[PDB]
């Protein structure tokens, strides 16, 4: 337990530093303010909120093995967890669809995406995440019914997660399983277009004269490896009881959290962004 605090103190610092740097670099310089960069700001805001108001309280609760903040703060913390996770995941699908539209139809891309439409889309995404998280949890439509659930809800010092079979399925479907297929289809089409363009170039100037695969592999693999096992066990532990332990659940959930710190290292590797970072 001595080194656990040391290792968990670095995650908060990394998340906060990366997201603060990204937000400050976007806000300070006018040349970086485009339509595409609006979604990155929302993703950074969600990751920053997760790094600030989620990781420290969870780490303290794990270390002390007791929730010393009554019963209101446990529910508020759970609502914030769900809200931040959903709002972070949906922005990746938004960005993927944006790139799909930008590459597949280049003539109509300028007219399709505007500042007002981007703002409307971001507001809709955040509203949907809030409806998924805050509305059911605070209205007590997610609690379970077994004796252990009642006992843990009664205790003020105990704050554990118990849900009914329908809520887990609905939340997993809304948060993870719907964006995944959309992103897979989008990136398949993008890879096809890139391959076609490369073939045309080679057929044109082949006599005188890998990147897409690596980029797509990074983008898909990071997200899938970070968030896939948790949303499998989230249904496994309700379908088949007495099959999933608590420590495994916590470990997979925390593996999911650290994906919020890797985001600035994937969506902000641009010469303009690097120059902006250097100027700071």
């Amino acid at each position: 337990v001595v080194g656990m605090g040391i290792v968990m103190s670095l995650i908060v610092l990394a998340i906060v530093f990366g997201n603060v740097l990204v937000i400050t670099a976007i806000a300070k310089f006018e040349r970086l303010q485009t339509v595409t960069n609006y979604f990155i700001t929302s993703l950074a805001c969600a990751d920053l909120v997760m790094g600030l108001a989620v990781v420290p309280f969870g780490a303290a609760h794990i270390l002390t093995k007791t929730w010393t903040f009554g019963n209101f703060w446990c529910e508020f913390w759970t609502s914030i967890d769900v809200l931040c996770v959903t709002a972070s995941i949906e922005t990746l699908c938004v960005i993927a669809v944006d790139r799909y539209f930008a590459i597949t139809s280049p003539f109509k891309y300028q007219s399709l995406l505007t500042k007002n439409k981007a703002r409307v889309i971001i507001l809709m995404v955040w509203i949907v995440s809030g409806l998924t998280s805050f509305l059911p949890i605070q209205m007590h439509w997610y609690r379970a019914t077994h004796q252990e659930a009642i006992n843990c809800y009664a205790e003020e010092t105990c704050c554990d997660f118990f849900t009914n079979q329908a809520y887990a399925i609905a939340s997993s479907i809304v948060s993870f399983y719907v964006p995944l297929v959309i992103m897979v289809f989008v990136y398949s089409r993008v890879f096809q277009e890139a391959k076609r363009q490369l073939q045309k170039i080679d057929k044109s100037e082949g006599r005188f004269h890998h990147k897409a695969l690596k980029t797509l592999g990074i983008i898909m693999g990071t997200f899938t490896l970070c968030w896939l096992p948790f949303f499998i066990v989230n249904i496994v532990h309700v379908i088949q009881d007495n099959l999933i332990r608590k420590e495994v659940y916590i470990l997979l959930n925390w593996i999911g959290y650290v994906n919020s710190g890797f985001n600035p290292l994937i969506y902000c590797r641009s010469p303009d962004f690097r120059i902006a970072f250097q100027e700071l």
Partner: protein
């Protein structure tokens, strides 16, 4: 007092609204620059489809062409203004290898090399039209003139394996056409690396497929730019 301030604010609001309205029209049009050597056929190719500008629409897309013919200086100090165009159209008469006017193709090649290697024009692609195909075929069929007299390297040149000659093409006319196209592509490929490319076409004065060719080339140009921006290409 505030009486002048209110009128100033109203005028500023009206001007800003007009500018916002005009920005949408400005951002959804494509500008093209038309260049060519002397007697190459710029006027004939533009009529079929200080300064001269034409506007045409294909597939509900707005296009806007320019033809700078008012200035005929050997140097081009006005070439730095056209550093934000979609593409450049270069027209050359490929059937003028025996006109002294160094012959004409040498001057055209030098002009193409100078345009390609320019500080401001380092991210603009070129659509290349090799005009006057029928005259080139007629010259090749006749034995009066030989290309090796003016271009010695043609003697050791051989037709590339990847070719698409039409049924009416003789083995010699195809060889000459591909020799000239390769002569241009050799200069094209050496200088740039991924930033901008060249699109060569064989054109005469009776075909009416040039608008489709420009449309497809511009679509490819924008698609490649977007692919390269995201590091997918």
């Amino acid at each position: 007092q505030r009486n002048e301030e209110k009128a100033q604010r109203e005028a500023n609001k009206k001007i800003e609204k007009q500018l916002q309205k005009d920005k949408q029209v400005y951002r959804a049009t494509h500008r093209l620059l038309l260049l060519g050597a002397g007697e190459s056929g710029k006027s004939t190719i533009v009529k079929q489809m200080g300064i001269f500008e034409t506007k045409f629409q294909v597939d509900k897309v707005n296009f806007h062409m320019f033809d700078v013919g008012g200035q005929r200086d050997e140097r081009r100090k006005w070439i730095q203004c056209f550093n934000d165009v979609t593409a450049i159209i270069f027209v050359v008469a490929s059937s003028s290898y025996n006109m002294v006017i160094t012959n004409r193709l040498q001057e055209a090649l030098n002009l193409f090399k100078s345009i390609w290697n320019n500080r401001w024009l380092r991210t603009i692609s070129v659509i290349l039209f090799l005009n006057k195909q029928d005259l080139l075929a007629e010259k090749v069929l006749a034995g009066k003139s030989k290309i090796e007299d003016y271009f010695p390297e043609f003697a050791r040149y051989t037709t590339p394996e990847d070719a698409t000659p039409e049924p009416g093409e003789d083995p010699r006319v195809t060889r000459a056409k591909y020799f000239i196209r390769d002569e241009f592509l050799r200069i094209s490929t050496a200088s740039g690396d991924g930033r901008h490319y060249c699109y060569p076409h064989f054109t005469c004065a009776v075909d009416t497929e040039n608008i489709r060719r420009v449309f497809n080339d511009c679509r490819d140009i924008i698609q490649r730019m977007h692919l390269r921006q995201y590091e997918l290409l």
